[PDB]
Amino acid sequence: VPSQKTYQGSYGFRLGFLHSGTAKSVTCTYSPALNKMFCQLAKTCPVQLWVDSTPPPGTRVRAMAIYKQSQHMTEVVRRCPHHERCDGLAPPQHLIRVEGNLRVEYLDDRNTFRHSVVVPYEPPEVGSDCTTIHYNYMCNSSCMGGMNRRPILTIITLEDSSGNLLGRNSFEVCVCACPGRDRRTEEENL
Amino acid sequence: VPSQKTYQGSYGFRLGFLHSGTAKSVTCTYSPALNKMFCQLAKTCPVQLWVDSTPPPGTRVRAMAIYKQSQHMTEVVRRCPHHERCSDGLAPPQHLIRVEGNLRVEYLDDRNTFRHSVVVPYEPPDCTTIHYNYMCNSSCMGGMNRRPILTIITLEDSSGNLLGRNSFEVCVCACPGRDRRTEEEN
Amino acid sequence: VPSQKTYQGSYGFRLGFLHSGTAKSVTCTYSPALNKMFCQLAKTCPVQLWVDSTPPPGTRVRAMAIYKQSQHMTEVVRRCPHHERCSDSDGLAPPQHLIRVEGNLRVEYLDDRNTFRHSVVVPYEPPEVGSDCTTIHYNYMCNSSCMGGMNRRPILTIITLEDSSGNLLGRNSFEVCVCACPGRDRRTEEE
Amino acid sequence: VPSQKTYQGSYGFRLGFLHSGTAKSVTCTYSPALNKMFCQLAKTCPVQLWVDSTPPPGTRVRAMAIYKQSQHMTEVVRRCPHHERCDGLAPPQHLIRVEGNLRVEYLDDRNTFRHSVVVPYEPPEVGSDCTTIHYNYMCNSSCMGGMNRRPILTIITLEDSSGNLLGRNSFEVCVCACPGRDRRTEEEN
Ligand SMILES: *C[C@@H]1C(=O)C2CCN1CC2
Ligand SMILES: *C[C@@H]1C(=O)C2CCN1CC2
Ligand SMILES: *C[C@@H]1C(=O)C2CCN1CC2
Ligand SMILES: *C[C@@H]1C(=O)C2CCN1CC2
Ligand SMILES: *C[C@H]1C(=O)C2CCN1CC2
Ligand SMILES: *C[C@H]1C(=O)C2CCN1CC2
Ligand SMILES: *C[C@H]1C(=O)C2CCN1CC2
Ligand SMILES: *C[C@H]1C(=O)C2CCN1CC2
Ligand SMILES: *C[C@H]1C(=O)C2CCN1CC2
Ligand SMILES: *C[C@H]1C(=O)C2CCN1CC2
Ligand SMILES: [Zn+2]
Ligand SMILES: [Zn+2]
Ligand SMILES: [Zn+2]
Ligand SMILES: [Zn+2]
């Protein structure tokens, strides 16, 4: 199973998320207490990259989903049969897409059969302190043919142009209709 | 500029404050005559919620800081760059107002106004108390820089409908007891 | 494992370091309490050599890094795969070597044929006109936190004074952190 | 030339000193009339920090010596060659050390070449009203090749974690064999 161990590494790599709140109209919202992103099917899911020093051009950022529970960790996370039968760049089986990036790259691992999506690292824009990638999750947590309500973790890895690992972080993910209500409910139960 | 007007609304919503006095040891103290809270950096600032009838479960209580002077009211109130680099794991580093001791605390960066606020669930008690922390001094250059602020406390239902609103002024300074006594002399 | 045992030897060989303090912007700074240098990736790290009597011409000054923890001491300290990738600023130095010397055209780098350890050596030069010490500017080419390299493990640098034929004359050592803000890391560690 | 202007600042920074008197046995004694400390070489010289409100954690306290006389003020105060010979954590050239503090930090200023010593500000223990720092002076005022009978001032500055001035005070210092007699004799004039 792919490592999920957090490493800030040489560049001080960590993730951040918008402080979106839990209003009914929010389409994605992150829970710091749960380290868990709540988002809507195929909607924009901003993840921020925070670094202490700037990685060189050529650095790449990879995202991969794995099942959190130990008895499902060896199963490849993929879309359900229904949603797979629905882009011109992403493989129809992949749960995680990146939108708004024409240099996006998709991988089916030839040995593990796991799916991942990678984009070029770009430094923050002029007035910004973080790089933002817009992920899309293409299947509901409740899709019976896929995750089937099993919790998943998204692993974000920073790697150089030769594939050497530079840092790693991760967050749990829920894909459901009303992420504001779901966040509020799950924090009530803790 | 977000609305600052007082409204007790349907539930008779008001704010209360402990009668802590101005002895040297006080870590925070409220002046009724100035409707002003004097507190210390990152120390407990208790605010009581008074209601004539209980809001339904799912009610929420929001706090937001705004500059009091009309020439500064459109500037977002945020921590100075020094303190923003100076976390509880839950709060954004730029936010002036935190809530301590509440694991269901939620923080908002408004996508369009860019203003900061902190919201907790309303819990029934004879008063509901929220422990706020103010994370930047009134005197911080680059932050409030000696400009007066108001904290706006809003009661909202679970759908975000406004139920009531109150407010108070706040000082964040090293000796709240001495500051209150001095300003009330003028 | 090469020796880290301090020995002033017959020339009274000692190390000195600038008294730089811990301001946030300082580029390197040494902690006497920790016998530890805090420096930045690829930036100047001055180390002073102090001798009681002047070593003969042909004397050489070697620097080598070793891991401090016993379960890693037989591992060669080297740059991580990421940083060991060749660059156009490598110059006179092997791309795998953690420790460089800057501003010295007579610098020499060694991959030991038998132990595979890396080291960098320069001629010993006596202090200039109105000076009491000789300064060498080292650069450390990999952060302490580099994945696939030091990977947060602590290291020592061993400075040896050698004769023209390589016999040990003197030896000292110090620990090294390579991090983004040495002033902060030192002030925080001394708490 | 560093500032010696007294500056109580926002925290109400003041110095205090023990009321030690001038008996023969005393090793450090302060003259209020002269604002001048009389202490022996390398012995404990206590200096109290008094504040009206507690400065934040991360505050630091710096000490630096300058020559009191205007015609010597640009000369760096340092130890004489005799005493400078190589001790613990301190640089051998530094006149002013701090005793009993593992977090002490010493600075040779890269631009002014001045020496100084810095420790973290600690608040007074609950019950106590002031913070004491134990300084040591490592050269006699009479040392040939060092101070050479020239009077010096010790400047104590309060700074925040980024080095910004919060407060400043100063006092004269005389390092000599018998501080009690020296103080008593100097107050006769
Ligand atoms: C992290 C960055 C910033 O500095 C602000 C908030 C979110 N992104 C874009 C603007
Ligand atoms: C040891 C030498 C000197 O005599 C001064 C201080 C540090 N180095 C360079 C100049
Ligand atoms: C700077 C180094 C490191 O990276 C860890 C923590 C402190 N030192 C020793 C090990
Ligand atoms: C240091 C003292 C003085 O002030 C003078 C000269 C030497 N001792 C005795 C008298
Ligand atoms: C997203 C949500 C679900 O639907 C189950 C897995 C994780 N989280 C809790 C239960
Ligand atoms: C808290 C105190 C200050 O520091 C200024 C703004 C508000 N109040 C009066 C002056
Ligand atoms: C980059 C690579 C080369 O091409 C030679 C010089 C340094 N490195 C090893 C050999
Ligand atoms: C310590 C670190 C910082 O935070 C900036 C100034 C100096 N150094 C590089 C960037
Ligand atoms: C602050 C000062 C005093 O007044 C006594 C107690 C502690 N310190 C030394 C003596
Ligand atoms: C210590 C004594 C001296 O030797 C001169 C300077 C200060 N004090 C008075 C004169
Ligand atoms: Zn599906
Ligand atoms: Zn501030
Ligand atoms: Zn590296
Ligand atoms: Zn002397």
Author numbering:
A (entry chain A): 97 to 182, 186 to 289
B (entry chain D): 97 to 182, 185 to 223, 228 to 288
C (entry chain B): 97 to 287
D (entry chain C): 97 to 182, 186 to 288
What do the study authors state?
The human p53 tumor suppressor is a 393-residue protein that in response to cellular stress, acts as a transcription factor by binding as a tetramer to a wide range of DNA response elements, activating various events including DNA repair, cell-cycle arrest, senescence or apoptosis. Mutations in the p53 gene were observed in more than half of human cancers. To uncover the structural basis of rescuing p53 mutants by MQ we investigated by X-ray crystallography high-resolution structures of the core domains of mutant and wild-type p53 bound to MQ in the absence and/or the presence of their DNA response elements. These studies reveal diverse binding modes of MQ to specific cysteine residues that stabilize the proteins and their interaction with DNA.
In the crystal structures obtained by the soaking procedure referred as R273H-MQ (I) and R273C-MQ (I), bound MQ has been identified at residues: C182, C229, C275 and C277 in both structures, as well as at C273 in R273C-MQ (I). MQ-C229 conjugates are observed solely in the crystal structures R273H-MQ (I) and R273C-MQ (I), obtained by the soaking procedure. MQs bound to C275 in monomer C of R273C-MQ (I) forms CH···O interactions with MQr bound to C273, and with the side chain of D281. This conjugate is also incompatible with DNA binding. MQ-C275 in the structure of R273C-MQ (I) is close to the nearby MQ-C273 conjugate. In all monomers, a pivotal hydrogen bond is present between the tertiary amine of MQ and the amino group of K132, being further supported by the negatively charged E285 side chain. A common water molecule is anchoring several residues to form a stabilizing network of hydrogen bonds and CH···O interactions. These MQ-C273 conjugates are likely compatible with DNA binding as indicated by comparing the structure of an R273C-MQ monomer with that of wild-type p53 monomers interacting with DNA.
